[PDB]
Amino acid sequence: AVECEPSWQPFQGHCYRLQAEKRSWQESKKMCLRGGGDLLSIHSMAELEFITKQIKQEVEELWIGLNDLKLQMNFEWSDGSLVSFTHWHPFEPNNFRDEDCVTIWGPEGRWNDSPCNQSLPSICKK
Numbered sequence: 560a561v562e563c564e565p566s567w568q569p570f571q572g573h574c575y576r577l578q579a580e581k582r583s584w585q586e587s588k589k590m591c592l593r594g595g596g597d598l599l600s601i602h603s604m605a606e607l608e609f610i611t612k613q614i615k616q617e618v619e620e621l622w623i624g625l626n627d628l629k630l631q632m633n634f635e636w637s638d639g640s641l642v643s644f645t646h647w648h649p650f651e652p653n654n655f656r657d658e659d660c661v662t663i664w665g666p667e668g669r670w671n672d673s674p675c676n677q678s679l680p681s682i683c684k685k
């Protein structure tokens with residue numbers, strides 16, 4: 560049957576890849592699009608735990624697809640899927656820097672809104 564490309568890891572119907580190179584959020588998204596995917600969306604605790612345990616691993620902070628670029632304080636996934644699940648750090652999102660793109664950081668995989676021009680690794684989903 561159909562499989563992920565080499566170096567993409569399968570999970571619950573989709574393929575996942577850590578992009579190690581540090582880029583801005585938009586640059587990370589463009590790289591995912593070039594590979595036929597998009598930035599990671601996370602729709603369940605089970606998918607979050609796969610991400611932190613197998614994809615992110617020791618990497619401390621990376622971009623995912625959540626963002627409020629279009630409408631402040633209304634976060635959406637760049638890939639167009641529904642926001643059915645969130646895992647924010649306490650008091651995030653806080654739109655501190657005047658922050659419209661979302662990172663995962665820390666061992667529990669909780670999320671933070673960050674300046675989009677920060678260079679960080681990312682995760683694509685396919």
Ligand SMILES: CO[C@@H]1O[C@@H](C)[C@@H](O)[C@@H](O)[C@@H]1O
Pocket residue numbers: 651653655658671672673674
């Ligand atoms: C006070 O705000 C928190 O700490 C800052 C260093 C930033 O990482 C910011 O995104 C985060 O929400």
Ligand SMILES: [Ca+2]
Pocket residue numbers: 627628631632654658659660672
């Ligand atoms: Ca914002």
Ligand SMILES: [Ca+2]
Pocket residue numbers: 651652653654655658671672673
């Ligand atoms: Ca923040």
